[PDB]
Amino acid sequence: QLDPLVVGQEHYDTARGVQSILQRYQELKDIIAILGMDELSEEDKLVVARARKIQRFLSQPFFVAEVFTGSPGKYVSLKDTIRGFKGIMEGEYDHLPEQAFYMVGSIEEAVEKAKKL
Amino acid sequence: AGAKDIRSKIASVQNTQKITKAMEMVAASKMRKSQDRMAASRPYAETMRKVIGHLAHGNLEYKHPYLEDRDVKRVGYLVVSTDRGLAGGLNINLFKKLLAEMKTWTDKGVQADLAMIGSKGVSFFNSVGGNVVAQVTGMGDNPSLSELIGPVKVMLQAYDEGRLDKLYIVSNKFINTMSQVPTISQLLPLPASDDDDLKHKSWDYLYEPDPKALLDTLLRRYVESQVYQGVVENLASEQAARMVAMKAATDNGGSLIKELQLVYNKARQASITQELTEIVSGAA
Amino acid sequence: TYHLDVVSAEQQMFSGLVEKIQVTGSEGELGIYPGHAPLLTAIKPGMIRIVKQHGHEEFIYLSGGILEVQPGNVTVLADTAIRGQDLDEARAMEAKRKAEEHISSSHGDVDYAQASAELAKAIAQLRVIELTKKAM
Structure with missing residues (x-):
């Protein structure tokens, strides 16, 4: 069902951008392992950081996992998730730390978690 | 996976480790030559x-x-x-x-x-x-200093021409053979001497031709050396940093060898058994 | 005799014991014997004559500089290249042009070039991560 004629152009483009930059991060992992992250071009450091922030924002707390951790479960609507990933990809949240995105609901919870570190 | 495909990458990473070792050695020699020139x-x-x-x-x-x-x-x-x-x-x-x-x-x-x-x-x-x-x-x-003459001349001209004020040099201070710190220091207006030449009371130079036109040249030549000095310290710091970085890269390669060899061993065991089981089970 | 230093911004050029020297200061020729009064001057591009004690004579070419003499000591802060109002302005003009354009040169480190290209080709396309199960 991940076709523009089924899910709309905005959803399709967001999903494909996420895939594209996670794949670009996969391609950089092997050189980061050898030489360290300081050899990367200035724009490659940015795709690395945004890829790690996407990887964190993909996490979510569950109502059934509410007994393995203590976090309350979150329900995220499709509109909010594409609204958040489209925001991350184009750099409007570049200033937050990675941990602001770990185990949150919509992006407006990540901006709040950033305040409490 | 594939045993041959993994052995090829083991060989590639070993070659990389060897290259990085050679670079560490070259940098560790250039560092000494540079810090003596310093x-x-x-x-x-x-x-x-x-x-x-x-x-x-x-x-x-x-x-x-x-x-x-x-x-x-x-x-x-x-x-x-x-x-x-x-x-x-x-x-x-x-x-x-x-x-x-x-x-x-x-x-x-x-x-x-x-x-x-x-x-x-x-x-x-x-x-x-x-x-x-x-x-x-x-x-x-x-x-060379005869190449630093240019941009330092541009900045000095822009200063005395009235445009710039309080210009700086930014560079890496070489402190230890594994410790270099970025510093921003002030060259002009001239920083304040810790020492006092009140003890020079008892003598004065016979300035030929005349003291003001001579102090001008002295000050211009002085900023130049301090810049040149900043350039050479930055170069020795570069050599030391490359030495440390290639050291780290050689150890990272040496650990990837361990992981790839574990994977290769598992792959070759699985290949031996998957072949010999097909042979034995094929014989009715 | 007195101590004499000939020093450039890059490296030292003479550090012996001398009995007298002769230079062409900007205002004329000039001869320094021991005990000369403290003096400061510019010197023009040309030769300078040193006589080391025991009378050994030698000639050092200087591209200019500043001569400063003290009680019992003397130094020549020699320039490393010819200096002038026009030459330095030509060098500054080229330094400005190279920045108003975006033209840049190639460093001469052929060894770094060799090693860097070898390491770039060796590290390329080796799909180690996702071959070994290393998360990071």
């Missing part, structure tokens, strides 16, 4: 700063623009950077410190200008959009 440069600046202190802060203290703190409305920086990568985080720490201070200066609404030594900063600041106005690149292992 010591060959002290006497000029020292024995010239004593003279400048005598003519400037001694008796009959003369008056010169480079000695006094006119009000600041725009600032200038001389930026030294490496021409070669693989130096670790050396250049980016320095450029980030420069951007922090240059942003603090533009909070007060002052304008700022840049002069670049080395190709890396030239590449960086055009991407950030900095106002570079003069540059020299391609120095490599052989930094």
